[PDB]
């Protein structure tokens, strides 16, 4: 198990646009494209990031591509950010990869906000750090990957993805 595993089982592949979990336009491996509610704006975004005409259709390769950019994205993020790069320097394999999965799904910028999270991540106390995530609206809006996502964590392993 590696970090793009455990976020193609979290997040699947689809070749088509469709609209995520929020409502929000989005393709291939939980790539998001755009927030509006406007579908053409969504294919706009897919065209730029493709470098095509797409039509909101893409192949399983060029999806491949956009997950291979979002997880670096997803990583450089961390590093950059003074917030989450602490944290992942103090973290075990497992668990960074479970700090980046957080960061795929909601942004640097949302996870930075996890503030008491983050503390007892670092304080490497990890069944306290996992009642706290759970609180919320992350939990409460996708409790099953969020509970996988958790279980990571607190356990330092794989389990939850096997």
Same mark, same amino acid.
């Given at each position: 198990?590696?970090?793009?595993?455990?976020?193609?089982?979290?997040?699947? &592949?689809?070749?088509? +646009?469709?609209?995520? @979990?929020? =409502?929000?336009? %989005?393709?291939?491996?939980?790539?998001? !494209?755009?927030?509006?509610?406007?579908?053409?704006?969504?294919?706009?975004? &897919?065209?730029?990031? +493709?470098?095509?005409? @797409?039509? =909101?259709?893409? %192949?399983?390769?060029?999806?491949?591509? !956009?997950?291979?950019?979002?997880?670096?994205?997803?990583?450089?993020?961390? &590093?950059?950010?003074?917030?989450?790069?602490?944290?992942?320097?103090?973290?075990?394999?497992?668990?960074?990869?479970? !700090?980046?999965?957080?960061?795929?799904?909601?942004?640097?910028?949302?996870?930075?906000?996890?503030?008491?999270?983050?503390?007892?991540?670092?304080?490497?106390?990890?069944?306290?750090?996992?009642?706290?995530?759970?609180?919320?609206?992350?939990?409460?809006?996708?409790?099953?990957?969020?509970?996988?996502?958790?279980?990571?964590?607190?356990?330092?392993?794989?389990?939850?993805?096997?």
């Amino acid at each position: 198990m590696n970090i793009f595993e455990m976020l193609r089982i979290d997040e699947g &592949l689809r070749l088509k +646009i469709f609209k995520d @979990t929020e =409502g929000y336009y %989005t393709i291939g491996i939980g790539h998001l !494209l755009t927030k509006s509610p406007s579908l053409n704006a969504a294919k706009s975004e &897919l065209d730029k990031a +493709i470098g095509r005409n @797409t039509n =909101g259709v893409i %192949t399983k390769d060029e999806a491949e591509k !956009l997950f291979n950019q979002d997880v670096d994205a997803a990583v450089r993020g961390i &590093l950059r950010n003074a917030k989450l790069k602490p944290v992942y320097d103090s973290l075990d394999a497992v668990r960074r990869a479970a !700090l980046i999965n957080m960061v795929f799904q909601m942004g640097e910028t949302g996870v930075a906000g996890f503030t008491n999270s983050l503390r007892m991540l670092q304080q490497k106390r990890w069944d306290e750090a996992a009642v706290n995530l759970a609180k919320s609206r992350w939990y409460n809006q996708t409790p099953n990957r969020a509970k996988r996502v958790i279980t990571t964590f607190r356990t330092g392993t794989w389990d939850a993805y096997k």
